[PDB]
Amino acid sequence: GSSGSSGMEPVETWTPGKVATWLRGLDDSLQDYPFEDWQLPGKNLLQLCPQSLEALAVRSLGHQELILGGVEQLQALSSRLQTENSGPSSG
């Protein structure tokens, strides 16, 4: 099925077609990289590394820090503690 911007699903589940949107937004310096081609799934987006990115023509550090940095925040919101049953309440 398809959800309508309802709920904050984990990135580890996100599809390799949405990431491109989350990557292009991060910054323009990255908007250049062929995301639509990267076809990289979320499960891999949260398990990325400075040794792999290189393969995608991402050797430069500055660019790595930009992404890797934001990913660190995702791994958190994505990796929850038995949220299925009960999770944190923001209020």
Curated annotation (Swiss-Prot):
Positions of the SAM domain: 14-77
Signal peptide: none
Top-level lineage group: Eukaryota
Entry's localization field: Cytoplasm; Membrane
Post-translational modification: Phosphorylated on tyrosine.
Complexes and interactors: Interacts with RHO and RALGDS.
Protein family according to the UniProt entry: Belongs to the CNKSR family.
Function: May function as an adapter protein or regulator of Ras signaling pathways.
Record protein name field: Connector enhancer of kinase suppressor of ras 1
From-to range in the entire protein, with total length: 1 to 78 of 720
